[PDB]
C-alpha cells in the first residue's frame, strides 16, 4: 500500500501550475483536460507518480473559486535551504506567510508559503526535521 496523491481544487489552473513549477521547482507529471466533464486535472511533483506521492490540482471550467475552511492544513516540502526558497517565492511575487526560522518550540528550520489560491505550503529544511 502507498499514498498516491493529495488533491486540491484551484480557481486558475495556469496560475497554480506557475507557482508549483516556478516557485517550487516541481514538474508537471501528467495533465488531463476533459471537455466532456468540463474539468482539468494536473499532477505535479518531484518524482514519477509510480515512485512517490504527488500533488493533484483540479480545475472545474465553470467554477471561479472555492471556499477554504480550517480543516485542511498544508502540504509540506523538504528543501535544501528554506531562506533561499522563501527569497525565490518573494522575488517571483508569491506570498511568504512565515519567513524561514526555527519552529516556535524546536530546532527545525521551517517557513510557510501560500500558493495563489491561498493553500499553505510548509517548507522544512533538510536535516532539521
Residues at the annotated binding site for succinate?
Answer: 38
| Dist CA 40 CA 33 (whole Å) | 4
Query: Which listed residue (62, 64, 105, 127) binds a second copy by CB under 8 A?
Result: 105
Q: Exactly one of 8, 76, 83, 87 binds Zn ion (CB under 5 A); which one?
A: 76
Q: What count of residues does the chain have?
A: 129
Nearer Cβ to Ni ion (39/46): 39
Phi-psi domain of 14 (left: phi exceeds 0; alpha: psi -120 through 50; beta: other):
alpha
36 makes contact, choosing from Zn ion, a second copy, Ni ion, none, with CB < 5 to 8 Å by partner type, with a second copy
Which of 18, 49, 114, 122 is flagged as catalytic? 122
60: burial class by Cβ within 10 Å (0-12, 13-18, 19+)? middle
- Whether the CB-CB separation of 83 and 100 falls below 8 Å is answered with yes
Query: What residues make contact with a second copy under the rule CB under 8 A?
Result: 1-9, 24-26, 32, 34, 36-37, 41, 45-47, 52-56, 58, 66-80, 103-105, 117, 119, 122, 124, 129
Amino acid at each position: 500500500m502507498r499514498i498516491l496523491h493529495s488533491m486540491l481544487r484551484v480557481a486558475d489552473l495556469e496560475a497554480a501550475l506557475e507557482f508549483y513549477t516556478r516557485a517550487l521547482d516541481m514538474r508537471l507529471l501528467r495533465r488531463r483536460d476533459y471537455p466532456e466533464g468540463r474539468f482539468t486535472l494536473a499532477f505535479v511533483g518531484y518524482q514519477d507518480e509510480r515512485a512517490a506521492a504527488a500533488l493533484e490540482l483540479t480545475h472545474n471550467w465553470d467554477r471561479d473559486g472555492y471556499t477554504q475552511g480550517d480543516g485542511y492544513g498544508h502540504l509540506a516540502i523538504e528543501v535544501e535551504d528554506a531562506a533561499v526558497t522563501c527569497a525565490r517565492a518573494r522575488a517571483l511575487g508569491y506570498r511568504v506567510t512565515r519567513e524561514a526560522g526555527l519552529m516556535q518550540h524546536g530546532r527545525s528550520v521551517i517557513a510557510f508559503l501560500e500558493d495563489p489560491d491561498g493553500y499553505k505550503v510548509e517548507l522544512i529544511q533538510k536535516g532539521t526535521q
